Amino acid sequence: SKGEELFTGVVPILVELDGDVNGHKFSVRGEGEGDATIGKLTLKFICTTGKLPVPWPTLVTTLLQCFARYPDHMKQHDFFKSAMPEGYVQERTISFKDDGKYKTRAVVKFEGDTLVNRIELKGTDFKEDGNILGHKLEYNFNSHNVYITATRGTQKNGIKANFTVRHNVEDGSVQLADHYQQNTPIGDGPVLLPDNHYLSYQTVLSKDPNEKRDHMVLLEFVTAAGIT
């Protein structure tokens, strides 16, 4: 409700990811803006260590839920903003159906006027010619609901989420990626504990027609729902 105030207009965003997949080290950097009042993100990413060793779509979910639009009747259930300035840790296991897993840890917080997402990612046990290390995913995204639940302490008060992403494969098939999420507040200020509900995501991947670097332009539309 107080952190709510930080998102009344357009907010500039920085993103830094450092990764290791099956020993291949790599880095991503991105910037853009978010407008929680209309639930939109825009971001551009570059790979700063050379060739990206995993497909861009596999990173979309790792590379800002505080930018969801929560409808009026649901503002009490927005943990994400109620955790700002000061932020939250966002942890995930992303399991790929017949392939490796990513473990991710992010710090999401304000630094001055900028909202920062800094992430470590460890990827293990991928197949050399799977859909991931073999770069066989299509450059597009599908639509998914992120299911959120509360969780008190006895850590401290945070949330959990779960959901399954569906990656389109070259050959017409689908590559499932199951996500299991934990979010813990950085500070000790009051945060809001939500009833069960979900975030509906819609996502577009494109290119900048004038950019020679291997990159990704990500557009996200996010609205909270699932409570009348």
Side-chain angles (χ1 to χ4, degrees), residues 2-96 98-100 102 104-151 153-154 156-181 183-211 213-228:
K2 326 161 200 219
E4 214 156 62
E5 307 174 57
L6 297 179
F7 295 86
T8 52
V10 181
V11 178
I13 302 164
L14 213 203
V15 182
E16 312 168 352
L17 164 65
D18 287 326
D20 182 319
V21 174
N22 269 205
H24 301 327
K25 314 281 216 166
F26 73 93
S27 290
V28 172
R29 310 279 182 269
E31 357 188 309
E33 23 189 72
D35 194 341
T37 71
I38 58 171
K40 189 187 187 179
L41 286 194
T42 314
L43 289 167
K44 181 182 164 160
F45 304 88
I46 265 93
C47 166
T48 69
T49 41
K51 188 189 217 188
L52 194 65
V54 304
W56 279 113
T58 80
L59 302 177
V60 162
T61 59
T62 300
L63 298 166
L64 292 157
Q65 312 187 156
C66 47
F67 290 99
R69 187 177 74 76
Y70 274 74
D72 287 358
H73 72 286
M74 278 181 83
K75 310 282 212 194
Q76 335 92 272
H77 307 279
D78 189 348
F79 160 86
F80 303 107
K81 305 179 183 54
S82 72
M84 306 295 177
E86 10 214 324
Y88 52 75
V89 190
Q90 165 160 127
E91 271 158 307
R92 290 212 181 103
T93 285
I94 297 177
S95 193
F96 289 89
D98 298 78
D99 221 329
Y102 292 166
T104 70
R105 179 174 195 274
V107 168
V108 177
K109 75 207 250 262
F110 275 97
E111 281 175 8
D113 72 344
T114 310
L115 188 267
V116 183
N117 183 19
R118 295 199 174 95
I119 325 154
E120 307 182 284
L121 141 9
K122 202 168 158 42
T124 59
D125 298 290
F126 285 84
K127 299 173 172 151
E128 287 172 340
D129 212 55
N131 291 321
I132 297 83
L133 289 183
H135 292 284
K136 291 148 169 201
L137 297 181
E138 292 194 330
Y139 187 75
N140 52 42
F141 225 73
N142 294 311
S143 213
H144 312 96
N145 306 148
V146 172
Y147 300 88
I148 286 159
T149 340
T151 18
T154 331
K156 51 188 139 164
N157 290 324
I159 52 124
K160 313 273 250 296
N162 62 94
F163 59 99
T164 299
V165 167
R166 300 154 199 187
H167 293 296
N168 289 160
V169 181
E170 283 179 347
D171 65 8
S173 73
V174 147
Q175 161 66 66
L176 301 162
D178 295 301
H179 290 60
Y180 319 90
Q181 204 175 298
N183 290 61
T184 323
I186 301 181
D188 311 349
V191 288
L192 298 168
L193 290 185
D195 288 353
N196 288 186
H197 71 275
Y198 69 92
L199 306 182
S200 148
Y201 269 82
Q202 293 186 269
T203 297
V204 174
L205 311 190
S206 50
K207 301 300 197 187
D208 181 336
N210 304 106
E211 172 66 73
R213 296 164 295 169
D214 179 37
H215 66 286
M216 169 165 73
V217 182
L218 173 66
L219 311 182
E220 291 180 348
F221 302 77
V222 189
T223 312
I227 294 175
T228 97

